[PDB]
Amino acid sequence: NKLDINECATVDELVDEINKSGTVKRKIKNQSVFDLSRECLGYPEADFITLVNNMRFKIENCKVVNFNIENTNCLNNPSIETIYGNFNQFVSIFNTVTDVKKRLFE
Amino acid sequence: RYITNRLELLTGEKIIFRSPDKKEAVHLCIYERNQNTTFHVNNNNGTIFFDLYSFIQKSEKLDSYKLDSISKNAFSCMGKVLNRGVREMTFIGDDTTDAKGKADTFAKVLTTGNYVTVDEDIICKVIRKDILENGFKVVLSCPTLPNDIYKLSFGKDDIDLAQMYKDYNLNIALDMARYCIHDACLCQYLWEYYGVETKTDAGAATYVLPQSMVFEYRASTIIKGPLLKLLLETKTILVRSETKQKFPYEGGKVFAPKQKMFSNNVLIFDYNSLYPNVCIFGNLSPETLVGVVVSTNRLEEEINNQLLLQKYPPPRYITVHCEPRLPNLISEIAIFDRSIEGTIPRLLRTFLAERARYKKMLKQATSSTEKAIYDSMQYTYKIVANSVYGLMGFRNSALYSYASAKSCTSIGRRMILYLESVLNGAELSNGMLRFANTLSNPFYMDDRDINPIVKTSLPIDYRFRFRSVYGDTDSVFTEIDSQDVDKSIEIAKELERLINSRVLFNNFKIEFEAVYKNLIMQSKKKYTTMKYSASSNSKSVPERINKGTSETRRDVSKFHKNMIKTYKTRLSEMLSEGRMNSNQVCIDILRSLETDLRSEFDSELFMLSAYICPANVPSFKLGSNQRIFYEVYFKRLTSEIVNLLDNKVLCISFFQRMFG
Amino acid sequence: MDVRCINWFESHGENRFLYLKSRCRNGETVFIRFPHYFYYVVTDEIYQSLSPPPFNARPMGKMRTIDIDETISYNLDIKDRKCSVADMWLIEEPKKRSIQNATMDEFFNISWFYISNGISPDGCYSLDEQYLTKINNGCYHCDDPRNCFAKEIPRFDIPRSYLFLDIECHFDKKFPSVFINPISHTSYCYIDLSGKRLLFTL
Questions:
Q1: What's the CA gap between B65 and B588, in Å, rounded?
Q2: For chain C, how many helices (H) and strands (E)?
Q3: Which contiguous run of DSSP H or E holds residue B292?
Q4: Which residue numbers delimit the DNA polymerase B exonuclease N-terminal domain (chain C) (predicted)?
Q5: First to last CA, chain A
Q6: Rounded CA gap, B515 and B531, in Å?
Q7: Whole-Å CA distances, C123 to B118, B236, C26, C157, C173
Q8: Distance between CA atoms of residues B8 and B4, nearest Å
């Protein structure tokens, strides 16, 4: 949806559709996996950060495998819990965009 | 200024300087170089118009820059009374009576002296002078005293000039001639005492510059000589095509000890030029910096963080965590490439190298003209070296490099914590010395024999343990808790043998100075007792009097104190022992202070560097209303000195006693 | 003739000069006057393409120029700095010219004199005596500092002079003023070239 392309049921189909699209490739190139995988989910700009800066993580191959929040106060904010509950989707799309960005400028 | 201005005023003629070729003429007119300003003379015929005031303001870090105090502590010697008398005494000064030579200097300035100080505070007019073959005989108008050996410090000159100007007659004219001539001659005894005539040359060879610039400029202006000479061998040019931005930051952390005295005499291990050694180790430079990488949020740190280890691996690369620039993100890893010599490391290496040489050719010199040339040279290099750290931070210098500056203090302060950490080291059973826990090396694994247990030279078996220490950017106060007696020294020697030789990695090294006895750390390293007894303990005489010398400015009232001296001396003498006078210290000082306070609440000196209060609780002058400030300073005298005792019970107990 | 240097100084009239004040073996004192030039550093390209031709210029060799600006990187892709390399020329002129892209600016016209010429302000030099023309009694002019200051000898002792002074003024208020107070005393320690110390007061 976010990159104005056709539906791709699998990931390599995706990388192809991106690669043939010089504009979409060239508008990925300038970006970061983080900003992009949060823009594809519409978190506003900032309070996302008050969340992110409240948890610890687990990464290998530049790829999240685990995470856990340790300060619970921020969830008492309304605009915060809507982001928290909606997180595992963001993790997954993050791993995916990492992988496509790796294999594309591979 | 007075002389030339008065001359203009009375006769309308001027002071004129020609050139050597007689084709330019100028008039005297003082100008300034505002940096704490500094005044200079505008002459162009080759003369050097010096001024000692500026010179000792720059090169010396003293508490008062009044001629009296400098002439006081510079020229001094211990003298010995031959006969006492009424209202006058006779002193002699020579060889072994005190150290070699200062007797001669004392005799030299005594040639025009008038008033001396008797070992402290006791001014006396001179009665008889006698230039010995080797020392001096003097006869003073001082009252008779108990002891036989005394200090002899040359000058306070308590004279009331205004009054003498009121009743001008011939006699005081002939007296004030003798005062002004002596002042002028002091202004030469000092210039010989500092040897400025050879520093002005050492500074013209190293700091490539004329002889009359050497003391007129700041560090940023004098380093460019050796720097240019370096750039010209290494075929290098550094160009900053950007306009710099300033991100102000820490200057440095203040360290504060929490005990002095019962500690049982602290050692005094010293760093030999940390900052230049760090700038060599880490190979910091404005052009060996690969880059800084940052992160605005977690989950970017740990990505970047396992990344920059897979690439940029040690030891070819060193990476440092700094304090975040723009208060907004939270990373600032800086990376440096330790494969070719940076420019600042070359500079520092040569500086330390040549200072270390002239340190030797001085030890091998025999004539008296060389032992000045070499000593001035090593002093020069010392200065130039110690001026390079603070200059990397100066935004306007030529060594400016923000990241390098921030990486200094960082490597350095890791080094400090790593030393002070592993220093607890209860040694016993023929050598235990675990230090702190491990002898690891930060910044990477060096594979360098981490064995906390270690065997020393081990004179005999011991049971002496060390207490956690306090340290600083420059020093390390390891307080032996065993307290041998004075032989404990053999313990610091061998300690230097190992810590700064086995618990250390690169050019970081050994010093072992010594400040024994139970100091009183009333404040920063600047304020305490001196009590210094160096490594030559054989038949020792230490420097007892003072290290703080925050006892020089009043700016306050002057009636009801003076005890500060007596409180201080009591507290000092009470710690002659080390074990059981802790409680006795607190008990006696606070009881006696309460007794004094109450006695003269109900019935001369205030130095320690108008709103009126009632005293009805159980343009600033005094009255019969003394009962005001009895109450405050007595609370103070104990609230200030808290970093010596640990009887935290009676302290707040007397605090509460005086509450009502 | 073998001199030891005492002090160098400048003159900021319409015309620039550098003076060396020096003392010989026997104690007679000499002044030497060099001209004073503005220096610059140019790349070869700028050296030939420049007009009018400079007064003098001689090659420094082949130097590496480095950019050292500090730039915060974000991703990880660290790039590498522009370490160009070229041949350098050192250019001297009697007047002040502004030249675009002239590096090595941070240094004073006085260090360029001592470095590029092999002169140390402490040296004891045996001057080569044919380059020094009379101007006045104790004032010779030089034009080729290289050949003149070509030699060197070990250090030798000299005499020096001094004067240490002090005054005292009449005062009755806080602290005196030149319009109201005369000078009461004036003292002086005069040590001469012959080396006798004389004291006196007026």
A1: 38
A2: 3, 13
A3: strand B289-293
A4: 1-22
A5: 24
A6: 7
A7: 47, 28, 17, 12, 52
A8: 6
Partners of B451 in beta bridges? none
Which residues of chain A neighbour B297 with C-beta distances below 8 Å?
Answer: 49, 52-53
Strands B463-464 and B427-428: antiparallel
**CA of B162, closest CA in chain C: separation in Å?**
6
Which pair of structure tokens corresponds to residue B414? 């890791």
Q: Which two tokens stand for residue C58?
A: 């001689």
**E-strand spans in A16-99?**
55-60, 63-69
DSSP calls for B480-539: BSS--SS-THHHHHHHHHHHHHHS--SS---------S-----SSTTSS---B--S--TT
* Residue A52 token pair: 């992110």
B404 neighbors B284 (Cβ within 8 angstroms):
yes
Neighbours of C44 (CB within 10 A): 13
Q: Residue B294 to residues A64, B100, B333, B598: CA-CA distances in angstroms?
A: 19, 61, 6, 63
| Interface residue of B4, B6, B399 to substitute, partner C, most C CBs within 10 Å | B6
Q: Quick one: which of B37, B176, B166 has its CA closest to B114?
A: B176
Q: Which residues pair with B606 in a beta bridge?
A: none
- Partners of B31 in the beta sheet? B40
Give SS3 for B543: strand
> Whose CA is closest to B473, among B546, B386, B399, B353?
B386
List of long-range contacts for B637-641, beta carbons under 8 Å, 24+ apart? B637/B563, B637/B564, B637/B567, B637/B593, B638/B589, B638/B590, B638/B593, B640/B522, B640/B608, B641/B520, B641/B522, B641/B571
Q: A17: distance to nearest CA of chain B, Å? A: 27
Note whether A49 contacts B296, CB cutoff 8 Å.
yes
Angle between helices B274-281 and B410-421 (to 10 degrees): 110
The residue whose two tokens read 């600016």 is C105
B445: left (phi over 0), alpha (psi -120 to 50) or beta: beta
Q: Length of chain B, please?
A: 660
- Half-sphere exposure of residue B276, counting CA atoms within 13 Å on the CB side? 21
- With breaks defined as C to next N over 2.5 Å, after which residues does chain B break? 35, 603, 609, 618
- Secondary structure of residue B27 in the 3-state scheme: strand
Decide if C90 contacts C39 (C-beta within 8 A): yes
Phi-psi region of C108 (alpha: psi -120 to 50; beta: other; left: phi over 0): beta
From chain B, the residues in CB contact with C72 under 8 A are 292-294, 325
User: Phi and psi (nearest 5°) for C185?
Assistant: -125, 155
Cβ–Cβ < 8 Å for B399, B344: yes
Q: At what angle do helices B581-602 and B648-657 cross, to 10 degrees?
A: 10
Half-sphere exposure of B646 (CA within 13 A, CB side): 10
Taking the C-alpha atoms of residue B463 and residue B486, their distance in angstroms, rounded to an integer, is 16
Residue C197 to residue C193: CA distance in whole angstroms:
10
| Pairing relationship of beta strands C139-141 and C29-35 according to DSSP bridges | parallel
The greatest distance separating any two alpha carbons of chain A, rounded to the nearest whole angstrom, comes to: 46
* Residue B442 contacts residue B507 (beta carbons within 8 Å): no
Calpha distance B595→B210 (Å, rounded): 65
Residues of A in contact with B300 (CB under 8 A): 34
Residue B453: how many other CB atoms lie within 10 Å: 10
Technique employed here was cryo-EM
Q: How far apart are CA C99 and CA B599, in angstroms?
A: 83
Count, in order, helices (H) and strands (E) of chain B: 21, 18
**What SS3 state is found at B145?**
coil
